[PDB]
Symmetry: D2
């Protein structure tokens, strides 16, 4: 599992559950091609997006659909989505975790890249 | 000034200086049209991107060129750019400050929205 | 103004208003002596805590009373207060801005340190 | 394990390893009594601090020794330590995770409280 996503809710102090996540890969023509998607689990995690074989070097975009999350909780949020855009590099460690901490008017995202 | 950007560097404890910022607006055909651009000052602020008249309702993307910023400092960061996407002015005109706190493998962003 | 505090509310996208702030300084005997206190303005800023003369070298604790802030808004938060502890002025006088971004189960804080 | 700590490094994009963590409980006289301590693991985590039986309601302080962490990496940091002060409440979910994301001049901490 070379790419995982973890999403946390800073208002409730919980994992952010049932958040839609869409991953795209940047194509040669510089458009964003759908790559993988899913919804976060009860633990705020989304595993199984891709495989080592398919996750080649390139630029990827992870879009986290924060607006729908907040609206489902009855809260009015600022963003349309949270977006994380990065280059996958083979010279780095093998596993990418993209973590995001959500608030209605803010977020904070880090990458944890490990062997 | 209805849209302003503030960027801080969490490594050095300073304003993030000379950070390029490109703003796009979603057009009727659903693509991202270039809207305004600039770079942060010595105070990490970017003023004067647009005007009240031009900043109409829509969906805007503020791309903060964090990779270019880190590379110019000779460091290899993780993200390409921090993107902030939001609907603006859909309850009338507001003033928006988009703030970002940058580290090489992480960034934070928040919005401060005021009603003049 | 060598020590200033800025607090933002990540729930409402606004300055955090009327947030109490207590600053302590570690005394020679190792306890936390009260140093200055104030509350944030309508802009979420707190100026005038101290002076250049009084703000000598030392270890300072800035306690931001986030629980009191959230409770006054009728919400039940997780932390008691955000504490920011740092050595100041140990390479000569500097100006410090302590910024904090608050949510009920989370907060961020960064420092901006400038040399006049 | 009612209390866990997770520490991440926002400069390196990694877990923060071998970070000292000290937990205190606020005593009746309002002093801070040592309660539990340890160093984060290779995954940036510290488990086994306490037990359900010992972790009673009260105010706790988790001090993360960030200054030593940064200095060991050759980096000059701003803070003496990161401090997380909170009330443990039995009406809430059973497990507290205190997460912290470190930079030299900044940090960000959340609580994930789950069943
Ligand atoms: O199940 C697991 O292995 C772990 O899940 C962990 O949850 C995570 C996992 C992860 O890869 C990253 C985070 C990141 C927290 C974070 C905190 C602040 C911020 O600005 C951004 C992110 C939390 C729990 O914190 C830990 O307590 C548990 O053990
Ligand atoms: O628009 C607003 O109401 C306010 O936003 C403010 O934006 C700032 C300015 C500043 O000096 C620091 C900050 C700190 C932002 C911050 C962002 C992310 C984080 O994790 C921690 C702090 C924000 C402007 O300083 C103020 O002039 C304006 O008024």
């Amino acid at each position: 599992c070379p790419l995982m996503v973890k999403v946390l809710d800073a208002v409730r102090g919980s994992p952010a559950i049932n958040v839609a996540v869409h991953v795209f890969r940047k194509a040669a023509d510089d458009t964003w091609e759908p790559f993988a998607s899913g919804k976060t689990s009860e633990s705020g995690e989304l595993h199984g997006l891709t495989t080592e074989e398919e996750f080649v070097e390139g630029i990827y975009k992870v879009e986290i659909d924060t607006k729908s999350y907040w609206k489902a909780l009855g809260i009015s949020p600022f963003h349309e989505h949270a977006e994380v855009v990065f280059t996958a590099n083979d010279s780095g460690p093998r596993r990418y975790t993209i973590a995001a901490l959500l608030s209605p008017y803010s977020y904070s995202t880090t990458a944890v890249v490990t062997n």
